[PDB]
DNA sequence: CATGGGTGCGCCAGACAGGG
DNA sequence: CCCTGTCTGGCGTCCTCTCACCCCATG
């Protein structure tokens, strides 16, 4: 829902879900591109922490 | 012999990280310890001394290397090496299509109001680089001309 | 350069079809050269009607044919957008050559 | 325009080492 | 293995009434 002004005051769960989906899309694209080992380890580790 | 390594930067300031890295090299004049810098990850041709490691992590807006450990970080294990050289040539001489079209062959439209629609190419024109395909719009087939890139092969 | 050919038989049903597609294009694209017709097309066939004799009973029927071409002037990304899966004329063959 | 990353609390309690 | 020290977690009163302010930043 927005506030008086009009800027949408967004919830925290939307930040969390949007982070997980951004990272998951990045990880699918790197497994498409066949990135090396350390890149996809950091990518999966960032998804795990997300 | 200089081997490759992977550097993590603040994603978005990556060109400025690359420029500041080249400038820190030419400041602290370890010119014989750095080969290139390739562009959120920055590829660095390098050798491993602890002095050069402190140099790259003292470059601003750089988090650190990405490897097995932080004592002896890991040379980027790029499976594609000579294949990555051919992949750079693939991106360079971009493999493009002129008029991918065939009679009675179904195609796919993903551009213009006809996007998200399929149809068949009754006629093809490689010289004019145009495919004659009609779309089943409101039942009646709508023969329209679409480019090879404007439509996908089905 | 963009052609909208319309192919049917009668001029008494295509006459509302040339009205619906110039005006709905006017509200969205407003870019059209106007309907330019084509010569009326005739398919006459004399056929024998007596069941086993008499080569004199030849009755003339015809499947009549008409063609009208709209020819919008500019490739508009609003005329085609609103009039893609849309055609008032029923039992008609539309040819939106883009 | 859209995305991308301090240093003043105190007790209980059980799990994890650490001697013992 | 039997006791001893450490290391992290889990927790701390209820209703109300205003106020002020909520992501830069930028090629």
Query: Which of C65, C67, C63 has the alpha carbon at shortest distance from C17?
Result: C67
Please name the method used to determine this structure.
Answer: cryo-EM
Rounded alpha-carbon distances, angstroms, from residue B80 to B43, B87, B141, C27: 14, 9, 47, 55
- DSSP codes of every residue in C26-63: HHHT------EE---B--EEEEE-SSSS-TT-EEEEE-
Query: Nucleic chain E: which protein residues 1-50 of A have CB below 7 A from it?
Result: 3-4, 9, 15
Distance between CA C39 and CA C75 in Å, rounded?
Answer: 26
Q: Indicate yes or no: CB of A38 within 8 angstroms of CB of B66.
A: yes
Give the contacts of C42 (CB within 8 A, at least 6 positions apart): C62, C64, C65
- Nearest residue on chain B to C98, alpha-carbon basis: B144
Rounded alpha-carbon distances, angstroms, from residue C4 to A35, B124, C69, C89, C97: 49, 19, 6, 14, 6
All domains of chain C in start order, with CATH: 1-98 (3.30.70.600)
The answer to whether B13 touches B60, Cβ cutoff 8 Å, is no
Length of chain A: 50
Length of chain B: 154
Distance between CA C75 and CA B141 in Å, rounded?
Answer: 19
- Number of Cβ within 10 Å of residue B103's Cβ equals 10
User: Which chain C residues touch B130 with a CB distance below 8 Å?
Assistant: none
The answer to whether B9 touches B62, Cβ cutoff 8 Å, is yes
The answer to whether A2 touches A9, Cβ cutoff 8 Å, is yes
- Does the CB of A22 fall within 7 Å of any strand D atom? yes
Kindly report the CATH number that applies to the domain delimited by B1-90.
Answer: 3.30.70.940
CA of C64, C1' of D12: distance in angstroms: 99
The answer to whether B127 touches B145, Cβ cutoff 8 Å, is no
Resolution in A: 5.1
Query: Which of C34, C97, C22 has the alpha carbon at shortest distance from B114?
Result: C97
The answer to whether C71 touches C1, Cβ cutoff 8 Å, is no
Distance between CA B70 and CA B63 in Å, rounded?
Answer: 12
Q: Indicate yes or no: CB of B78 within 8 angstroms of CB of A36.
A: yes
SS3 B84: helix
Rounded alpha-carbon distances, angstroms, from residue B133 to A6, B43, B122: 47, 46, 6
Q: Indicate yes or no: CB of B76 within 8 angstroms of CB of A34.
A: no
Give the contacts of A11 (CB within 8 A, at least 6 positions apart): none
- For residue C98, the 8-state DSSP code is -
- Number of Cβ within 10 Å of residue C54's Cβ equals 9
């Amino acid at each position: 829902v927005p506030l008086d002004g009009g800027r949408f005051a967004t919830s925290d769960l939307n930040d969390l879900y949007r982070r997980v989906i951004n990272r998951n899309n990045r990880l699918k694209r790197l497994l498409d591109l066949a990135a090396p080992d350390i890149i996809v380890r950091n990518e999966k580790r960032m998804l795990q922490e997300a | 012999k200089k081997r490759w390594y992977v550097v993590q930067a603040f994603s978005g300031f990556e060109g400025r990280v690359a420029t500041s890295l080249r400038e820190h090299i030419k400041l602290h004049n370890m010119e014989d310890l750095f080969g290139e810098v390739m562009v959120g990850y920055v590829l660095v041709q390098m050798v491993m001394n602890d002095a050069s490691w402190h140099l790259v992590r003292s470059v601003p807006r750089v988090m650190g290397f990405i490897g097995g450990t932080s004592d002896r970080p890991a040379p980027i294990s790029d499976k594609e090496v000579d294949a990555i050289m051919n992949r750079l040539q693939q991106v360079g001489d971009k493999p493009r299509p002129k008029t991918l079209f065939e009679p009675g062959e179904m195609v796919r439209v993903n551009d213009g109001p006809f996007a998200d629609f399929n149809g068949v190419v009754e006629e093809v024109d490689y010289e004019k680089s145009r495919l004659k395909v009609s779309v089943s719009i409101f039942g009646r087939a709508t023969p329209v001309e679409l480019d090879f890139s404007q439509v996908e092969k089905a | 350069r963009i052609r909208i050919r319309l192919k049917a038989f009668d001029h008494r049903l295509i006459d509302q079809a040339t009205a619906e597609i110039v005006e709905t294009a006017k509200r969205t694209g407003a870019q059209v050269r106007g309907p330019i017709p084509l010569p009326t097309r005739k398919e006459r066939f004399t056929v024998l009607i007596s069941p086993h004799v008499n080569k004199d009973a030849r009755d003339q029927y015809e499947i009549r044919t008409h063609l009208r071409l709209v020819d919008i002037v500019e490739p508009t990304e609003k005329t085609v957008d609103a009039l893609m899966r849309l055609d008032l004329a029923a039992g008609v063959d539309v040819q939106i050559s883009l």
